[PDB]
């Protein structure tokens, strides 16, 4: 009954684990998206974005994926492309780690390196150039705007949380990169299951564009070290309407929190998992949130 046709379908069904050294009386519970193909939450959108492109006819036998991503999305797309038999090109700043390069090359990616100094702008520019050269050949999946992104979270991530909490979840805390996670989860719990939970978006204090935007202040992006969050803009896949609260976390707190997850909980999560937990811990220690079950997405693992 339970044999996946390929590795793309093995996505999700990730565990909920209660934290002992965060929250209050066990009110903080984490969902470990590190327990996935390719070791992060992006496995879900890598899978669904391909599936959707196949269904709508935009991706066929023969055609090749092209995408600018310096992160988990690249790894996710590569694994799915490998599992389903697609050629894929990923553009990225030349400054990417040898580890990451080797892993992508190993997955069979055509890696196209761009000028480090030009950063992501460089990579996106080149990706668009490649597609321009033969639009009938190349397809750009577009994680920041593709509805298949939050759609998988609505169908899988959100329902898994509803299910495993017996509908008792009261707050969802997720870092925002594409926004797919918080948006999808939120729509599922609020609209599909009908529960008025608190949806808490998490972003770097160093680049707090969601907080600035909603406050009507000048939006001023900045650099930070919380890999996976803080795009420095509002992505189309963040539905602001479903966000109840926005919490900011600093890089150093985020880091130290991840180290504490490892040493005190035995949970191997990334820096952005640190950022999400720090934010949740802060809510968890407010009397308002004392009787509330807070669920925190940990987007990735640490190797």
């Amino acid at each position: 009954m339970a044999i996946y046709a390929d590795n793309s379908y093995s996505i999700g069904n990730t565990p909920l684990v209660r934290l002992k050294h965060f929250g209050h009386n066990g009110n903080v519970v984490v969902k470990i998206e590190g327990r996935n193909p390719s070791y992060s939450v992006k496995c879900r959108i890598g899978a669904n974005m391909v599936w959707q492109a196949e269904k709508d006819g935009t991706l066929t036998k023969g055609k090749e994926i092209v995408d600018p991503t310096s992160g988990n999305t690249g790894i996710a797309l590569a694994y799915v492309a490998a599992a389903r038999g697609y050629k894929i090109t990923l553009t990225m700043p030349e400054t990417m780690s040898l580890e990451r390069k080797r892993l992508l090359c190993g997955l069979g990616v055509n890696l196209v390196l761009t000028e480090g100094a030009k950063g992501m702008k460089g990579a996106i520019a080149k990706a668009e150039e490649i597609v321009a050269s033969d639009p009938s050949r190349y397809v750009m999946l577009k994680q920041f705007e593709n509805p298949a992104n939050p759609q998988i979270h609505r169908e899988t991530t959100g329902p898994e949380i509803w299910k495993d909490t017996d509908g008792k979840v009261d707050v969802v805390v997720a870092g925002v990169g594409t926004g797919g996670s918080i948006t999808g989860i939120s729509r599922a719990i609020k609209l599909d299951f009908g529960k008025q939970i608190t949806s808490v978006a998490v972003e770097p204090v160093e680049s707090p564009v969601i907080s600035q935007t909603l406050a009507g202040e000048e939006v001023k992006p900045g650099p930070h070290k919380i890999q996976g969050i803080g795009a420095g803009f509002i992505p189309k896949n963040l539905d602001l309407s479903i966000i109840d609260r926005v919490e900011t976390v600093d890089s150093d707190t985020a880091l130290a929190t991840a180290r504490r997850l490892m040493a005190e909980e035995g949970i191997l999560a990334g820096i952005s998992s640190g950022a999400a937990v720090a934010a949740a811990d802060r809510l968890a220690k407010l009397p308002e949130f004392a009787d509330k079950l807070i669920v925190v997405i940990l987007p990735s693992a640490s190797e």
Binding site: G74, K121, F144, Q227, P235
Partner: peptide, 7 residues
């Protein structure tokens, strides 16, 4: 993700 911008 990796560098939507910055990071």
């Amino acid at each position: 993700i990796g560098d939507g911008y910055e990071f």
